[PDB]
Write a protein that binds this ligand. Structure first.
Ligand SMILES: CC(=O)N[C@@H]1[C@@H](O)[C@H](O[C@@H]2O[C@H](CO)[C@@H](O)[C@H](O)[C@H]2NC(C)=O)[C@@H](CO)O[C@@H]1O
Ligand SMILES: [Cl-]
Ligand SMILES: [Cl-]
Ligand SMILES: [Cl-]
Ligand SMILES: [Cl-]
Ligand SMILES: [Cl-]
Ligand code: NA
Ligand code: NA
Length: 129
């Protein structure tokens, strides 16, 4: 599924991401925009052979099992394919674990490079939340 911006904002808000670990909702929407262009089915392969999955491009090196990232962890205890669902629950719940792990949203490269330090509230501007 390709979410609309506000649709995703609302979904993320419903799933408890607004101000989760201090990260306002726009951070999460911004991260999703730049990680996946709001596409739950996005996948990208990393240089190490892991793959990033879903709307928040959660990687299989650490967070999910895709059966083809040897030596990896599955810290969200999910098949990576669960992160491609139109239902963002699995991605959100995994993202909550990630963002809680001490590095905050810096885990999301796109967030660090394209959202961090910007006016992320713009990403939820106009949305009914
Ligand atoms: C939370 C999450 O999974 N974020 C993704 C990053 O992990 C991806 O970065 C890449 O991650 C792999 C596995 O750890 C690293 O081997 C790789 O070096 C790293 N790539 C970069 C440029 O840092 C990122 C890839 O775009 O996608 C999500 O942000
Ligand atoms: Cl868009
Ligand atoms: Cl915000
Ligand atoms: Cl694996
Ligand atoms: Cl959802
Ligand atoms: Cl933080
Ligand atoms: Na990415
Ligand atoms: Na894994």
């Amino acid at each position: 599924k390709v979410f609309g911006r506000c649709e995703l904002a609302a979904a993320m808000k419903r799933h408890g991401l607004d101000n989760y670990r201090g990260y306002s909702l726009g951070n999460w929407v911004c991260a999703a925009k730049f990680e996946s262009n709001f596409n739950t089915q996005a996948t990208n392969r990393n240089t190490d052979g892991s793959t990033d999955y879903g709307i928040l491009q959660i990687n299989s090196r650490w967070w999910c099992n895709d059966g083809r990232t040897p030596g990896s962890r599955n810290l969200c205890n999910i098949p990576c394919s669960a992160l491609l669902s139109s239902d963002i629950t699995a991605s959100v719940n995994c993202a909550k674990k990630i963002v809680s792990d001490g590095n905050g949203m810096n885990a999301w490269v796109a967030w660090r490079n394209r959202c961090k330090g910007t006016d992320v509230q713009a990403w939820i501007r106009g949305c009914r939340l």
